Amino acid sequence: CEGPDACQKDEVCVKPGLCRCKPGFFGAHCSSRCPGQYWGPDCRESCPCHPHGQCEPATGACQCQADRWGARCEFPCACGPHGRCDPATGVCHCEPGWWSSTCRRPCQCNTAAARCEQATGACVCKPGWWGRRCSFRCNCHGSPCEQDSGRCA
C-alpha cells in the first residue's frame, strides 16, 4: 500500500492500492469531522442512532446521549438523579440506597444493608447481617446467615 499508492498521514489504507480519509473524517485534506449520521473512513457508513447520539468513528458502536436509550437512541430515560440510565433498555440502575423503577425512593434500612430491591425496597444485607432491615449480626463466627432467621451458612 506504498510507493505511488502510498498513503500520506490523516488517511488509512482501505484497500491494498487505495486510501481513504481516516475514520470519522472527510474532505479535501481529510480535515472535517463526519456528521453524526455517518462513521467509518470517509463517512462511508451509516450511524443508526443519530440524532440524540453518535457512533464511535472507527468501530461504529452506538453512543447515546446520557438521558437517551434505544436502538436509535430515540427514547428518553425516566431515571431520577440517583439512577443511571441503560442505553440499551431504558432500565434505571439504582445507586445503593435507592429503589423504584426510577431510583427515586430511598431505602428504609439500617447501615448494614448493601442496597435494596428495586421493586419493593426490601433490604439486602451485607454478608454477616440479618433481619428485616439488616439490623442483626449473625451468630455464625463470621459466616453469613439467613435474613429472616439468622440460621447460619
Residue numbers in the entry: 57 to 209
Question: What's in the article?
Answer:
SCARF1 (scavenger receptor class F member 1, SREC-1 or SR-F1) is a type I transmembrane protein that recognizes multiple endogenous and exogenous ligands such as modified low-density lipoproteins (LDLs) and is important for maintaining homeostasis and immunity. SCARF1 (MW, 86 kD) is a type I transmembrane protein that has a short signal peptide followed by a long extracellular region, a transmembrane helix, and a large cytoplasmic portion. Its ectodomain has three glycosylation sites and contains multiple EGF-like domains, which usually has a two-stranded β-sheet followed by a loop region and three conserved disulfide bonds. Here, we solve the crystal structures of the N-terminal fragments of human SCARF1, which show that SCARF1 forms homodimers and its epidermal growth factor (EGF)-like domains adopt a long-curved conformation.
Among them, two fragments (f1, 20–132aa and f2, 20–221aa) were crystallized and the crystals diffracted to 2.2 Å and 2.6 Å, respectively. The structure of f2 fragment was solved by molecular replacement using the structure of f1 fragment combined with the EGF-like fragments predicted by AlphaFold as phasing models and refined to 2.6 Å resolution. The crystal belongs to space group P4122 with one molecule per asymmetric unit. In the f2 crystal structure, the N-terminal region of SCARF1 (residue 20–56aa) and the C-terminal region (210–221aa) are largely missing, suggesting these regions are quite flexible, consistent with low electron density of the N-terminal end of the f1 crystal. Rest of the f2 fragment adopts a long-curved conformation with multiple EGF-like domains arranged in tandem. Interestingly, in the crystal of f2 fragment, although an asymmetric unit has only one molecule, the dimer related by the crystallographic twofold symmetry can be well superimposed with the dimer found in the asymmetric unit of f1 crystals, suggesting that dimerization occurs in a similar fashion for the two fragments in different crystal forms. At the dimeric interfaces of f1 and f2 fragments, hydrogen bonds are formed between S88 and Y94 of the monomers, and F82 and Y94 are also close to each other, thus may form π-π interaction. But the salt bridges are not found in f2 crystals, suggesting they are not required for dimerization. To identify the binding site for modified LDLs on the region identified above (133–221aa), we calculated the surface electrostatic potential of the region based on the crystal structure of f2 fragment and found a positively charged area in this region, which is mainly composed of two sites, one is R160 and R161 (Site 1), the other is R188 and R189 (Site 2). The triple or quadruple mutants, R160S/R161S/R188S, R160S/R188S/R189S, and R160S/R161S/R188S/R189S, where positive charges are largely removed for the two sites, almost lost binding activities with modified LDLs completely, suggesting these arginines are crucial for lipoprotein interaction and both sites contribute to the recognition.
